[PDB]
Amino acid sequence: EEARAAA
Amino acid sequence: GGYDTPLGITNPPIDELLDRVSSKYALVIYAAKRARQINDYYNQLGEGILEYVGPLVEPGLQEKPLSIALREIHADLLEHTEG
């Protein structure tokens, strides 16, 4: 979730 | 943990990868599915944007998708659920 938001 | 830096097919080290999942079989399927996802992201880039995303980490000049998937694994950028 955190890196999906980062993308 | 003072190992000399790995090179080639052993980067990232598998012992640090195994702390993320239960067994090496889970790592195998993890990385296989993620590498497939990256591959069809590269395939479905010409047409309209669909639900697939990645690579979240920046690849190299030319890099195989499985290496990208395993490096994403080591960077703690994914999650999963088993069967």
Q: How many CB atoms lie within 10 A of CB B59?
A: 15
Give A-chain residues touching B77 at CB under 8 angstroms: 3
Q: Report the alpha-carbon angle B39-B19-B82, nearest 5.
A: 60
- Long-range own/partner contacts, residues A1-7 (CB < 8 A, 24 or more apart): A1/B79, A3/B56, A3/B77, A3/B78, A4/B53, A4/B56, A6/B56, A7/B53, A7/B54, A7/B56
Residue-range domain boundaries for chain B: 1-83
Per the entry, the structure determination technique was cryo-EM
Alpha-carbon distance A2 to nearest alpha carbon in chain B (angstroms): 8
Which positions 1-7 of A are in contact with B (Cβ < 8 Å)?
1, 3-4, 6-7
Token digits of residue B72: 């994403």
User: What is the structure's resolution, reported in angstroms to one decimal?
Assistant: 3.4
